[PDB]
Amino acid sequence: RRVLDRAARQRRINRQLEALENDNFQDDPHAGRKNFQALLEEQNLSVAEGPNYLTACAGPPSRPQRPFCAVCGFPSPYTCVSCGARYCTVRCLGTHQETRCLKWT
């Protein structure tokens, strides 16, 4: 099977994390000004330049990350080779491969 490089996995993780901040998943039912990144770039906010938004971010946790199954949520001893997703059972591996491994269905 194919293998996804580190950049692809990091992009997928970032996209999944950003999707959790989305206001709505659908479009405007009517169907017919800035954003946070524009505000950050306009502030010209530099690290170590006093207390600010960036310096207030929580640091890395000391306790290691606990793996959970991407399908059912129970703890997952196994890591998928192709995409790096965690899984816990043959059925869960098959479901993950059918649904979200490689191509994002």
Binding site: R63, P64, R66, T79
Partner: protein, 121 residues
């Protein structure tokens, strides 16, 4: 007794060892006699290990890794042990019966000893 959060020998040789033990009821900072550093190094005690230290003898036993670190690797040959529940400092007044034969056999042969003759014995 507790999980080790810090293990820092203090140089003048080493004057003392500062250790940090964590339990469910809090954290305690302990200053150890420098002779205990050899025992800590023999037991291979690092941060995140659950150990106990006998106050009267300085004996150190590393009784596994804390189970909070069980997920730091997917496959390690480690024995993961729960974090101790009580206080870091545990006091118990006990009454134990021994016989004179126990003291005789305890003093019949030497124990420990880093010399070659002791090891071969």
């Amino acid at each position: 007794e507790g999980e080790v959060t810090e293990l820092t020998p203090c140089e003048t040789t080493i004057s003392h060892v500062i250790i940090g033990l964590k339990t469910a009821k809090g954290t305690k900072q302990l200053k150890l006699d420098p002779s205990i550093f050899e025992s800590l190094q023999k037991e291979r005690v690092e941060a995140g290990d659950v150990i106990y230290i006998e106050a009267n003898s300085g004996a150190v036993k590393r009784q596994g890794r804390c189970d909070t670190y069980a997920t730091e690797f997917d496959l390690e040959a480690e024995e993961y042990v729960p974090l101790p529940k009580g206080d870091v400092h545990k006091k118990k007044e006990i009454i134990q019966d021994v016989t004179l034969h126990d003291l005789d056999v305890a003093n019949a042969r030497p124990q420990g000893g880093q010399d070659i003759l002791s090891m071969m014995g």
